[PDB]
């Protein structure tokens, strides 16, 4: 299923700090952020997505249309400019962010009643699982 609509509450988080390090997030921010439970809110209508990543420490929103390249500033994450593109590979939603960092992007897919997410940058992969609330 390609339907990722919903409010998703984090169940597990692996190597989040490795991913943040590959983005050069500073020590203070990483040490706090790695402790925290996350929420993902996804509003999906056809190709149009609105995605929100939230915790008690950050609130990060992005809107995109599947298949349409967009220039993006990554704002409070790491303050960089990328060219971003989100597409479908089967039922895996795949984002590639072209720029300074290699292998930068994410993937999301549904496995049952849960949302699986990969965050990638450099040689680091962070793996997360969310439950539908
Ligand atoms: C599908 C997942 C997306 C678009 C996403 C974007 C950004 C983040 C994110 C933002 C900010 C931070 N900080 C400040 C540590 C971490 C991760 C997560 C997911």
From Swiss-Prot:
All-trans-retinol binds at residues 40, 108. Belongs to the calycin superfamily. Fatty-acid binding protein (FABP) family. It is found in: Cytoplasm. The lineage of its organism: Eukaryota, Metazoa, Chordata, Craniata, Vertebrata. It comes from the Eukaryota. The keyword Hydrolase does not apply. Keywords: Cytoplasm, Retinol-binding, Transport, Vitamin A. Transmembrane segments: none annotated. Forms a beta-barrel structure that accommodates hydrophobic ligands in its interior. GO terms for biological process: epidermis development; fatty acid transport; vitamin A metabolic process. Higher expression in adult small intestine and to a much lesser extent in fetal kidney. SUPFAM superfamilies: Lipocalins. InterPro entries: Calycin (IPR012674), Fatty_acid-bd (IPR000463), ILBP (IPR031259), Lipocln_cytosolic_FA-bd_dom (IPR000566). Intracellular transport of retinol. This is Retinol-binding protein 2. Its main location: cytoplasm. Coiled coil: none annotated. One of its GO terms (molecular function) is molecular carrier activity. PROSITE patterns: FABP. One of its GO terms (cellular component) is cytosol. It comes from Homo sapiens. PANTHER family: FATTY ACID BINDING PROTEIN.
């Amino acid at each position: 299923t390609r339907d990722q609509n919903g409010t998703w509450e984090m169940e597990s988080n692996e190597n989040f700090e490795g991913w943040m390090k590959a983005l050069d997030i500073d020590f203070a921010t990483r040490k706090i952020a790695v402790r925290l439970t996350q929420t993902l809110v996804i509003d999906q209508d056809g190709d149009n997505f609105k995605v929100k990543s939230t915790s008690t420490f950050w609130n990060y929103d992005v809107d995109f249309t599947v298949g349409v390249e967009f220039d993006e500033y990554t704002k409070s994450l790491d303050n960089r400019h990328v060219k971003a593109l989100v597409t479908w590979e089967g039922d895996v939603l795949v984002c590639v962010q072209k720029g300074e960092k290699e292998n930068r992007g994410w993937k999301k897919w549904i496995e049952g009643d849960k949302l699986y997410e990969e965050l990638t940058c450099g040689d680091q992969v962070c793996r997360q699982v969310f439950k539908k609330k």
